[PDB]
Design an enzyme around this catalytic site. Structure first.
Site, mmCIF file in Angstrom:
data_model
loop_
_atom_site.group_PDB
_atom_site.id
_atom_site.type_symbol
_atom_site.label_atom_id
_atom_site.label_comp_id
_atom_site.label_asym_id
_atom_site.label_seq_id
_atom_site.Cartn_x
_atom_site.Cartn_y
_atom_site.Cartn_z
ATOM 1 N N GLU A 121 -35.222 -34.936 -46.193
ATOM 2 C CA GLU A 121 -33.792 -34.995 -46.496
ATOM 3 C C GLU A 121 -33.016 -34.668 -45.237
ATOM 4 O O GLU A 121 -33.379 -33.744 -44.510
ATOM 5 C CB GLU A 121 -33.377 -34.010 -47.603
ATOM 6 N N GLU B 225 -37.858 -27.702 -52.581
ATOM 7 C CA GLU B 225 -36.914 -26.619 -52.273
ATOM 8 C C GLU B 225 -37.175 -25.381 -53.128
ATOM 9 O O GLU B 225 -36.249 -24.717 -53.611
ATOM 10 C CB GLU B 225 -35.457 -27.087 -52.405
ATOM 11 N N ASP C 25 -29.342 -30.025 -58.211
ATOM 12 C CA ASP C 25 -28.071 -30.705 -57.972
ATOM 13 C C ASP C 25 -27.830 -31.835 -58.985
ATOM 14 O O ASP C 25 -26.748 -31.926 -59.591
ATOM 15 C CB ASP C 25 -28.076 -31.204 -56.525
ATOM 16 N N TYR D 271 -29.997 -30.019 -42.792
ATOM 17 C CA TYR D 271 -28.624 -30.516 -42.825
ATOM 18 C C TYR D 271 -27.823 -29.967 -41.647
ATOM 19 O O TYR D 271 -26.719 -29.425 -41.796
ATOM 20 C CB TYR D 271 -27.997 -30.157 -44.165
HETATM 21 CL CL CL Z 1 -30.831 -33.595 -56.300
HETATM 22 CL CL CL Z 2 -27.198 -32.540 -50.792
#
Ligand code: CL
Ligand code: CL
Ligand code: CL
Ligand code: CL
Lengths: 597, 598
Positions: free
Chosen positions: B505, B414, B173, B470
């Site tokens: 996260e 991840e 990201d 999430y």
């Molecule tokens: Cl990231």
């Molecule tokens: Cl995110």
């Protein structure tokens, strides 16, 4: 004499910046001689940085008095064959420097460098370096702090008793203090070394003559060589002593936005030093400001050294960002409001072709915003002696910069009152005496009802006006602002000398908008500027426009400061407001030279 | 491999070479034309250290593909040649070629860990040029991973288009910030005998605190070691000692989260002198507990980034201090170095300030399926990162082994750990980390949210399960009742395994200044409700031993339709201003102890 410290074949350069120990004085730090031992129960502080915003504590931000910085200094004993020097680029405002509990030097003035040799005998196997830093301001400091005077910008509707004693700034910007700029150890040969270099230039046809004076300590032979950027020698003189001259055939001139720096290499005994140097001329002639004999139009800003979270601290990525934004916007210049900026910024402006109005720390010299310039005995301002020292030190530091074209002796002093001429005439005389290039001098004029009585008229080569037609007067009545602007500026235009805006602007909160003229909105900022330019563009002696301010910056607290000063064209994180785009368009269509010819 | 942090000592010069450097984009000819042999012509100026991408206003520069050249003059005293002269690059992102005059001195792969080279004294002329070529390209062989033929899942278009220029394709990201990220320094040591590495471990058994030392040297000389309190009192010392031994620390003060204590460990070897700060503490996993100094710890904190404006990834020492001050203001005790090793300056500051760190490798993007499987054989298209992944683990542990603040190694972020071959890829890396860490700290990998979470190979490898989840953002968006139910159903599985597990996260994109009283994505109120919903579940699970939000602060990313000028999941903005949820966490974490919560 304060040459910028550089790494050379004769000079080590050891940066001492990093994480230092830090302790607020509790009123006992000197009595208990904290500098003699490791600081106990201390915090940690980045150096260089202002200390005020690093933590989350109002008592730290609003501290009154001294703080103590400290680090270990363990250096090789073999450096003792060299002369060892500690350079403080800036400690704001006053400093006491200790090595191992011996006081080595003290300094007054928060924005100019100072240095001390370390006596060989003091250097033990393990050493402590302690810097005590004083933040207090009063009628004897530059910038000036109030004593009994009232708070005009931060006044209450109803008086109150403050919880704790605090500084009373006689200036807008926040009183960021601490070890503002890098601390470095450097070395030179012990017996013979270069202390200072002075260069002036003369242009005869396409041949530049560079006159030099090389100040040295010890007995050795002096040599000088001038090299192109690519490394070709274009002039060389050996065994020249202190003073001399030399010539460069077909010299490349330094121009705004088109910089060219030669490398001037000097040897003295075993010592080696290289100074970058741009060749250019500056002269005021009639109502023209001539750079390389061409009529310049200043486009730019008053700046501040202000970023988050370091405050006033040297921020080299942001310096490069700021110059990039200036070139993006079409600006060519700025003023170092209201204190000398870092050498790193000044050397970068030489490299990038940005013109600089170099200003002293003398803001707040005004007790009636008892007369300001009454005798000290009768309560007048007590700054003239230090003011002279600041001028000396500023010109000594910056004299060789091509980018510096004019000295600003003071910002918004009480120049319309009795005694002001008597205060300032010796300071203007000093600047003209000490600057080898005899560059123009000005003071930056406060807005005042009796503007024809501003002693700038008797002293300055360029009249530099701070004017807020449409903000501090005529707010939300820009038709009245235009009429009042024209009436005053036609007076200045009638004097036949160059004049300019060094400040004009309107507080603007990014994200506030209205189609219909409304103070603090992005649209009003644009309309404010359009209205002023309607007047200035018709005046032939008006030779420059520098907005207040390049970017939003921190200030003292009060009812008219919406989390600091919001007159930036950019936000504090350097984002463009509507007016930043307005000026990009406007400055794109105005040449640097020959706009008003 | 051994990388002691360079410091100024009685035997060692330290010359920072940071400052304004010359800078030139490669145009395809920079190596053919041997730009490193002369002064860079028609160059720009660029600050060092810094990422180069945001300093100017040029999209071509920001989105550059390939090489750039940095250069500065290097004029140093010839008397340095009596010493060993070393050039240390704390980080160059991603790959580097280093030239002194016309001579290639070293090459490095890996954008986030230091490397160094001696300068042969014959190479040092009266005037020298130092040129650093920096490559920004990423692919299936780099860490972080760049996509090759895989499509853009976060930045996909509704309609395909041909890009104007070839560009990197991040499989991660965060924005691909490159350049001379961290300081470049020259340092010296004695030539004939010097310290190359120091290893310290702590023994706390039988109510006796001891420091075990191993001193690695080059040359022949005598060794001495002393341990000193903050105030400079010697509490243990021995001279003419062995390369390995132990020292008893009477009255030992332990390093604790938010109550740091660092001794100074001073070493001499011949004429060489080096001082290492050191905190004494134990770390162990037992049952469902994460024990620091034998006490059951609860992580409170964040995944971070090294991200500030305008330096990008570049070392920002004032903001490092601001960030730690904000963590303590908020009641946090910890963070993870997502998704790459952070600067030594940050790590050393965390040791001084008492902030617990999960130290993570550069291994993000090890995932080709977010038909070739990620961990298929390389010869059939599988990911090509395992060899470099081993080097990163070795180099990270070699750099950070002595930090009290580091309590856990994160092997990857991840990765495709629910697919076939993942265990086989990761088993040698977990083995390597356990072999190389002298303190044998816990190891984890940070787990991608996945439908088949019971097949995550973390279950077979990790000492702590570290989950990125999430519930309420990438699923159950604007349906927090459904988020709570989904969260409880999966986290009850993790709790049933009886091992420590935590969030590394969880979060919701939030634009500061957007508000609604009624649950609405991207508003400040929804961010708070998102976290309240998740904590309703986690506070009931006895094996859930830590909460690290995504993210400490808003940070820059690649461009696309779901990135509102970067990632907006910060509790703070990019300029470190608190959103509503930052005040929520200050209140919550103020009521949660560092020890004994569960
Ligand atoms: Cl990231
Ligand atoms: Cl995110
Ligand atoms: Cl101001
Ligand atoms: Cl103002």
């Amino acid at each position: 004499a304060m040459l910028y410290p550089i790494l050379t074949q004769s000079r080590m350069l050891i940066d001492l910046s990093g994480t230092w120990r830090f302790k607020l004085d509790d009123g006992s730090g000197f009595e208990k001689k904290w500098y003699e031992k490791t600081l106990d129960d201390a915090q940690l502080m980045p150096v260089p940085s202002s200390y005020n915003d690093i933590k989350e504590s109002a008592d730290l931000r609003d501290h009154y008095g001294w703080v103590f910085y400290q680090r270990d200094l363990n250096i090789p004993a073999y450096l003792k064959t060299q002369r060892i020097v500690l350079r403080f680029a800036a400690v704001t405002h006053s400093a006491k420097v200790y090595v191992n509990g011996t006081l080595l030097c003290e300094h007054k003035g928060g924005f100019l460098p100072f240095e001390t040799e370390i006596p060989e005998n003091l250097i033990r196997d393990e050493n402590l370096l302690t810097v005590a830093v004083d933040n207090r301001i009063d009628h004897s400091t530059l910038p000036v702090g109030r004593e009994d005077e009232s708070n005009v910008l931060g006044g209450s509707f109803f008086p109150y008793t403050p919880t704790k004693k605090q500084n009373k700034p006689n200036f807008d910007f926040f009183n960021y203090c601490g070890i503002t700029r890098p601390v470095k150890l450097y070395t030179t040969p012990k017996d013979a070394y270069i202390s200072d270099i002075t260069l002036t230039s003369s242009l005869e046809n396409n041949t530049a003559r560079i006159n030099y004076k090389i100040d040295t300590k010890g007995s050795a032979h002096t040599a000088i060589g001038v090299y192109t950027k690519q490394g070709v020698c274009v002039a060389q003189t050996e065994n020249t002593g202190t003073e001399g001259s030399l010539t460069i055939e077909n010299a490349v001139l330094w121009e705004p936005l088109k910089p060219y720096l030669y490398e001037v290499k000097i040897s003295f005994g075993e010592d080696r030093y290289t100074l970058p140097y741009g060749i250019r001329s500056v002269a005021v002639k009639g109502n023209k400001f001539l750079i390389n004999n061409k009529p310049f139009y200043f486009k730019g800003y008053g700046k501040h050294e202000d970023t988050f979270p370091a405050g006033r601290g040297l921020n080299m990525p942001m310096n490069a960002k700021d110059i990039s934004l200036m070139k993006w916007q079409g600006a060519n210049s700025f003023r170092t409001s209201h204190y000398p900026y870092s050498e790193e910024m000044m050397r970068l402006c030489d490299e990038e072709g940005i013109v600089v109005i170099d200003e002293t720390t003398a803001v707040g010299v005004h007790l009636n915003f008892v007369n300001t310039f009454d005798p000290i005995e009768q309560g007048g301002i007590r700054t003239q002696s230090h003011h002279k020292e600041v001028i000396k030190d500023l010109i000594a530091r910056d004299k060789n910069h091509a980018c510096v074209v004019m000295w600003s002796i003071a910002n918004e002093a009480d120049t319309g009152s009795k005694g002001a001429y008597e205060y300032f005439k010796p300071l203007f005389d000093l600047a003209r005496e000490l600057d080898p290039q005899k560059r123009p001098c000005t003071l930056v004029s406060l807005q005042m009802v009796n503007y024809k009585e501003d002693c700038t008229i008797k002293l300055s080569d360029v009249f530099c006006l701070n004017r807020y037609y449409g903000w501090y007067t005529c707010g939300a009545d820009l038709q009245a602002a235009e009429k009042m602007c024209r009436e005053e500026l036609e007076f200045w235009n009638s004097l036949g000398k160059p004049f300019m805006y060094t400040e004009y602007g309107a507080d603007t909160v990014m994200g506030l908008h209205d189609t219909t003229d409304s103070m603090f909105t992005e649209e009003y900022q644009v309309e404010y500027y359009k209205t002023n330019h309607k007047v200035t563009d018709t005046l032939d002696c008006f030779i420059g426009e520098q907005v207040w301010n390049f970017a939003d910056f921190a200030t003292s607290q009060g009812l008219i400061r919406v989390q600091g000063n919001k007159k930036g064209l950019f936000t504090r994180d350097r984002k463009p407001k509507l007016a930043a785009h307005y000026f990009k368009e406007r400055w794109s269509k105005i040449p640097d030279f020959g706009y008003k010819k």
